[PDB]
Amino acid sequence: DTVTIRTRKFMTNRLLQRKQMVIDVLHPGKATVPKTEIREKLAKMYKTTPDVIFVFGFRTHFGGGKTTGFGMIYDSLDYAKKNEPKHRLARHGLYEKKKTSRKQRKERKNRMKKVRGTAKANVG
Amino acid sequence: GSLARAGKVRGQTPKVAKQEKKKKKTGRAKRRMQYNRRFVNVVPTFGKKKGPNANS
Amino acid sequence: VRMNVLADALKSINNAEKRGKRQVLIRPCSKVIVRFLTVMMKHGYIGEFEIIDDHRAGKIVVNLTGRLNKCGVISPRFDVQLKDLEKWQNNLLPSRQFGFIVLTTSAGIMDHEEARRKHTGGKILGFFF
Amino acid sequence: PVARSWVCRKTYVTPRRPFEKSRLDQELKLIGEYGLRNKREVWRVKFTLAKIRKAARELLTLDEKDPRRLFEGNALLRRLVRIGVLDEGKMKLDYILGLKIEDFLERRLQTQVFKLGLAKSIHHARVLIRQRHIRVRKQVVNIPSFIVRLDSQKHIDFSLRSPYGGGRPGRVKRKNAKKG
Amino acid sequence: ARGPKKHLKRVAAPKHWMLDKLTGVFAPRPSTGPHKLRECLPLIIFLRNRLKYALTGDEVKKICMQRFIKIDGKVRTDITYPAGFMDVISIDKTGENFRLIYDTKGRFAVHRITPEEAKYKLCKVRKIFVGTKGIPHLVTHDARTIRYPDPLIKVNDTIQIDLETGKITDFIKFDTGNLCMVTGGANLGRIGVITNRERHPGSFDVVHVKDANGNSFATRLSNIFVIGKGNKPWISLPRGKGIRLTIAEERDKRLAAKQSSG
Amino acid sequence: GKCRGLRTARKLRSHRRDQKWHDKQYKKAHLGTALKANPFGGASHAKGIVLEKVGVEAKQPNSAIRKCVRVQLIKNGKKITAFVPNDGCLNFIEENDEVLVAGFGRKGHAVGDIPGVRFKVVKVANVSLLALYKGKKERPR
RNA sequence: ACGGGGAAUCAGGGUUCGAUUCCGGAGAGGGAGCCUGAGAAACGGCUACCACAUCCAAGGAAGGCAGCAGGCGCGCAAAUUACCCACUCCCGACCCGGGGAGGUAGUGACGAAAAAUAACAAUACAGGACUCUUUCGAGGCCCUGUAAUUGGAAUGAGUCCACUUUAAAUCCUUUAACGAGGAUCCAUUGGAGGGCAAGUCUGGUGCCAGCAGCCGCGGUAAUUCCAGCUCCAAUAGCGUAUAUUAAAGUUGCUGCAGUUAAAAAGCUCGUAGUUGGAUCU
């Protein structure tokens, strides 16, 4: 009844300033353990703060014993913000996407196309 | 070629309701019942080859 | 007119074997006829034969052992590749245990088993079983 | 243009004559013996065996020392031996044509679960498998048609979360003990 | 129709990229460069599909725009840049150098080379011509024009050039007995010694090659790339030494390796 | 007899191609005259408007009155007599309504004792005749 | 009739199909002519005419969904006026912007794969099973089941929690809480004369209504219609209509036939075509 965290694959990616791994999670009687717990365990295992660790794509095997996912451990938080996708940063709370929609932006652009000069900045 | 008679027999036939019966099994259980009735039950057959719906 | 003297020779042999005769006279003779008869005789189907030399085109008297069921020609002589040989044997032979297809290959005239041994396809001449 | 794949394949063939007594009796015998759901499972195993026989025949037409015949024949013989339908001693292409449909139906997880004593009957085996009570090695298997390999034959256990090989009582037992 | 195409369908891509069909509709259409579209390896394929340094094309773009990748000693920021036969890929940050060499199955192997061997490459010359006031020129398979070549260098020979200076260091003549590599066709990726060349005027020449284990094969002259003088190579060969194994021996080696290692 | 020569491929091919026109099915399916004469025009089904109800007498060996409807197809305006299969089903059909009509099962041939009828009614007023017959659905108001 | 890769049975040979995601071509309502540009006779460029068609203050102006969605029409015949650039790639002056390409989606039975609708009694029974001593008598040793007297155990369909999944998300997977005894959490579709598996059982109808692919059934004791019961075929799938393949050795190259069943020209020359005697180490 203790969650076990393993790392099958491992590579030091100096090009993107991170360590990439596949993560095995053993939760025989528990649900799919949250990514925050996996990040805490990986932080304890690899001796770093958990805000440089991004984990994603966790799929639980049929039967409920093991879950397999991917993880990154960046050298610093700055490199994480530089290299991570914006949606993973938003998951960690380090990024916020626009509140607009595709339809709104497209229609605004097409309306702007109909005017010339500084008047383009006066539509919405 | 008179069309006046049309559905006459389905009209004049006495209406008999369907009797309520225990539901029949489905899937593997129905096949198991068929197999047991036809190959595990030997008592009815003494060698005269009677049909499963012979009412005479 | 008489074309394909091999067809006449094989038909005469087949007809004489059906009638139960001990010898058949084949005319005219030819090199291909002699080679086909030699292939037949190596397999014990036909026995010894003698080539009568008239000064125009030989005749052959063939002793007949009662072992032959059918000898036939294939006309036209289709070119047969080594990958199409099995289909020809299924079409022509009574079984895979006995019976031979006689091909003519650049390595000579021989049966299909030898043609597969020598890795040669050729042109189908006939068959016998 | 899509990033999908449309490679699909029907796994059975319907008999040419819909109603003939001998085939019906034989297939019902097979269903009753191995606890199958319908004639389609019989036809599926029949189709598997027919494809295997077709491959073995086409190999047997080839030259005995043909590299492709040797390679694919050894591959097919190894595949048949691995799942335990063919004896290791008789590993030749001609012994493939001696295989019967029952040799393949004996290797289903249903048959192996019933034969190892884990179930009272073949139908109890089917419901045990479908109810997630059975695992092969460490993996819970839910498909009764699972063709058990030779190396996984000795690893068909009674799972670890099921009340039969685990220890947590089920819904009915918990509810009835809660009414004590 | 109407000018050049800019897309490449994933199933129309070269099969030696080992791309899978469910990832997307498109494959990275390699940009124009020193190597042909069908016999190159885009930098994104090498960095993502082979080396697994990146998971998406965006990460390949980040790696390339960090100016970390050097092809033939030059920094290349184009992620679809066509890298081809004998091209040297040097990643200084991780301190490894690769040479694009065909493996025996006709695919570009991940062949790691020492930094000393990353300072040169072998180039098969495609044509020699004289132009601009009697100055001889030399065109290679790498689309490099080298002025003032040695008069003994003729077509189908392979020169060795230093990458830093881009000048010819040595060359191997095309002759029987010289080691060669096949860069196209059924025998692509195989290494052997040239035994005989058949000349067919007005058509393609045929070169016959024999392996170290005596296997003999043939291919068109355009597919021959001589590696070294005699039977020794001037470059380091991949894990397989150019020997093509039949499927029987491949299976036997795989089974033996499975048995020995647990 | 037939020609057996290595260069007789053209003769065999042309003879087969000419002799195929003496096959009834081949000529029917490739001449295109049976296609233009087909009221459905190659379609499996068609929608028409019921012009009237007609009862056609059965063929001689047995006696009955077959409840049919004369319908006019929408696609081409052709007039069609279609059999209304089950009993009482003629009462489910009203004059001047849409009906879906299929073939009778013999590919343009008359079926059974019904003379000169090769079409049958499948749906009337966009509800199947079987649902109306079995009471699963009622005629729309 | 867009071509091809290719698709529908395997005896061998073939017969059909290929608008359709990959390659090549063509077209953007029909023609025609052009500008720019490396590349267009480009149409989400322009200029005319032809056919339709929008606003108008009647002077004029503006059009091209065989792009994604959506409408109408045509029909036997085909989906949402949704979300997103997170993936695959493409484009740009660009690591940053954009992409109805493409990716992702509450009613898609086109079709393909896996797979529930149940698994285990004391009991009387028609039983049988290793020498059963008895037609009047051990039959949870082995099995079947008329069951208005039984019993516990198992589980997922479903409803919900935890956001695993993902660019916010649904789905599968995972864990919890409920969730089965007419386990009413109730399987259907076509048949029961033959071909062809399965009732000359009962009631009604009485050549009527209807059934019937074909042969036939029905004219007051219908094995066939309309129904009840029972039975069987496949089964979350079955029926029907068409086109097509095998069956068709009823198109026959393999491999048909031509005296009388359909069939050799009234006869003979004859060019092309097809075929052509032995013989060379």
Domain containing A21 — which CATH number? 3.30.70.3370
**Residue at the smallest CA–C1' distance to nucleotide G39:** E3
Gap between the Cα atoms of D53 and D149, Å rounded = 20
- How many distinct structural domains can be found in chain D? 1
Measure A66 CA to nearest chain D CA, in Å.
Answer: 10
Q: Same structural domain for residues E31 and E104? A: yes
Name which of F119, F59, F46, F121 is nearest F91 in CA terms: F121
Gap between the Cα atoms of C125 and B56, Å rounded = 69
**Residue in the structure block whose two tokens are 């049929």:** A62
CA of D8, C1' of G7: distance in angstroms: 13
Which amino acid belongs to residue D35? Answer: G
Q: E258 in a domain, yes or no?
A: no
B37: the nucleotide nearest its CA (via C1') is G144
Do the Cβ atoms of D147 and D107 come closer than 8 Å?
A: yes
Residues 6+ apart with CB under 8 A from C87: none
Measure D140 CA to nearest chain A CA, in Å.
Answer: 5
Indicate yes or no: CB of E25 within 8 angstroms of CB of D5: no
Do the Cβ atoms of E124 and E156 come closer than 8 Å?
A: yes
Helices D21-34 and B28-35 cross at an angle (nearest 10°) of 110
Spell out which residues of chain B touch residue D28, defining contact as CB-CB under 8 Å: 31, 34-35, 38-39
CA-based nearest residue in chain D for residue B29: D37
Running DSSP on this structure, what letter comes out for residue B37? I
Gap between the Cα atoms of D140 and D142, Å rounded = 7
State the sign of the Cα–Cα–Cα–Cα dihedral E2, E5, E9, E14: positive
Q: Rounded to the nearest 5°, which phi and psi values hold at F35?
A: -75, -40
Indicate yes or no: CB of D5 within 8 angstroms of CB of E21: yes
Q: Is F3 on the interface with C (CB under 8 A)?
A: no
Running DSSP on this structure, what letter comes out for residue B23? P
Q: Do chains F and A touch (3 or more CB pairs under 8 A)?
A: no
Residues 6+ apart with CB under 8 A from C109: C32, C35, C36, C39, C102, C103, C125
Q: Is B7 on the interface with F (CB under 8 A)?
A: yes
CA-based nearest residue in chain A for residue D136: A63
Give the B:D interface size as CB pairs under 8 Å. 32
For residue F72, CA distances in Å to C127, D138, F36, F43 come to: 67, 69, 17, 15
F86: the nucleotide nearest its CA (via C1') is G210
Six-digit token string for A124: 């919405």
Running DSSP on this structure, what letter comes out for residue F131? H
Gap between the Cα atoms of D106 and E112, Å rounded = 51
- How many distinct structural domains can be found in chain A? 1
Q: Is A65 on the interface with D (CB under 8 A)?
A: yes
Q: Rounded to the nearest 5°, which phi and psi values hold at D33?
A: -70, -40
Range of the domain at A120: 1-124
State the sign of the Cα–Cα–Cα–Cα dihedral C89, C92, C93, C95: positive
Q: D1 in a domain, yes or no?
A: no
Query: Is the bond preceding E14 in cis, omega lying within 30 degrees of 0?
Result: no
Bridge-based pairing of strands A66-74 and F127-128 is unpaired
Please name every residue paired with E71 in a beta bridge, in sequence order, or none if there are none: E74, E89
Coil, helix or strand at residue F18: helix
Gap between the Cα atoms of D32 and D25, Å rounded = 10
CA of C69, C1' of G85: distance in angstroms: 79
Do the Cβ atoms of D125 and D117 come closer than 8 Å?
A: no
Q: D122 in a domain, yes or no?
A: yes
Gap between the Cα atoms of F83 and F54, Å rounded = 9
Please name every residue paired with C110 in a beta bridge, in sequence order, or none if there are none: C103
Gap between the Cα atoms of D89 and D167, Å rounded = 43
Q: D144 in a domain, yes or no?
A: yes
Containing E208, the helix (H) or strand (E) segment is strand E206-210
Which of chain G's bases lie under 7 Å from a protein CB? 10, 12-13, 21-26, 37-43, 74-77, 82-91, 95-96, 98-104, 111-120, 126-127, 143-145, 147-148, 152-156, 162-168, 172-176, 178-179, 181-184, 186-187, 190, 192, 196-201, 203-205, 207-219, 225-236, 240-244, 250-258, 264, 273-280
- How many distinct structural domains can be found in chain F? 1
Six-digit token string for F6: 């290595």
Six-digit token string for C8: 């006449």
Q: Is B6 on the interface with F (CB under 8 A)?
A: yes
Gap between the Cα atoms of D46 and C14, Å rounded = 46
Spell out which residues of chain B touch residue D110, defining contact as CB-CB under 8 Å: none
- Please name the method used to determine this structure: cryo-EM
Strand arrangement of the beta sheet that strand E88-91 belongs to = E74-75, E69-71, E88-91, E96-102, E108-113
Six-digit token string for F81: 């007599």
Strand arrangement of the beta sheet that strand A53-60 belongs to = A4-13, A18-26, A66-74, A53-60
Best of B35, B38, B45, B49 to disrupt the D interface (most D CBs within 10 Å) is B35
Q: Do chains D and F touch (3 or more CB pairs under 8 A)?
A: no
Indicate yes or no: CB of B1 within 8 angstroms of CB of F54: yes
Instruction: Report resolution in angstroms.
Output: 2.7
Best of A8, A9, A10, A13 to disrupt the E interface (most E CBs within 10 Å) is A13
Of B27, B38, B40, the CB nearest to D37: B27
Q: D5 in a domain, yes or no?
A: no
Q: Is C38 on the interface with F (CB under 8 A)?
A: no
Spell out which residues of chain A touch residue D138, defining contact as CB-CB under 8 Å: 65
Indicate yes or no: CB of B38 within 8 angstroms of CB of D28: yes
**3-state secondary structure string, chain D?**
CCCCCCCCCCCCCCCCCCCCHHHHHHHHHHHHHHCCCCHHHHHHHHHHHHHHHHHHHHHHCCCCCCHHHHHHHHHHHHHHHHCCCCCCCCCCHHHCCCCCHHHHHCCEHHHHHHHCCCCCCHHHHHHHHHCCCCEECCEECCCCCCECCCCCHHHEECCCCCCCCCCCCCHHHHHHHCCC
D43: the nucleotide nearest its CA (via C1') is G234
Range of the domain at F105: 1-141
Gap between the Cα atoms of A75 and A20, Å rounded = 12
Spell out which residues of chain C touch residue F4, defining contact as CB-CB under 8 Å: 75-76
Name which of E6, E92, E17 is nearest E48 in CA terms: E17
Containing C36, the helix (H) or strand (E) segment is helix C31-42
Q: What is the dihedral of CA A107, A113, A116, A118, to 10 degrees?
A: 40
CA of B25, C1' of G241: distance in angstroms: 34
**Residue in the structure block whose two tokens are 């008239």:** C54
For residue E257, CA distances in Å to A13, E213, E251, E262 come to: 30, 21, 10, 9
Six-digit token string for D134: 């059975």
For residue F88, CA distances in Å to B4, D36, D43, F49 come to: 11, 44, 43, 20
CA of D173, C1' of G160: distance in angstroms: 22
Q: D13 in a domain, yes or no?
A: no
Q: Is F2 on the interface with C (CB under 8 A)?
A: no
Q: How many residues does chain B have?
A: 56
Q: Which of residues 9-68 of D touch E (CB under 8 A)?
A: 67
Range of the domain at D68: 18-180
Give the D:E interface size as CB pairs under 8 Å. 19
- Give CA angle at D30 (D26, D32), nearest 5°: 115
Spell out which residues of chain F touch residue C75, defining contact as CB-CB under 8 Å: 4
Coil, helix or strand at residue C42: helix
Spell out which residues of chain A touch residue E66, defining contact as CB-CB under 8 Å: 15
Six-digit token string for E117: 């061997």
CA-based nearest residue in chain C for residue F4: C76
Q: What end-to-end distance do the CA atoms of chain F give, in Å?
A: 71
CA of D13, C1' of G9: distance in angstroms: 12
Structural domains of chain C in order of their starting residue, each with its CATH number: 1-68 (3.30.1370.30), 69-129 (3.30.1490.10)
List of chains touching F (3+ CB pairs within 8 A): B, C
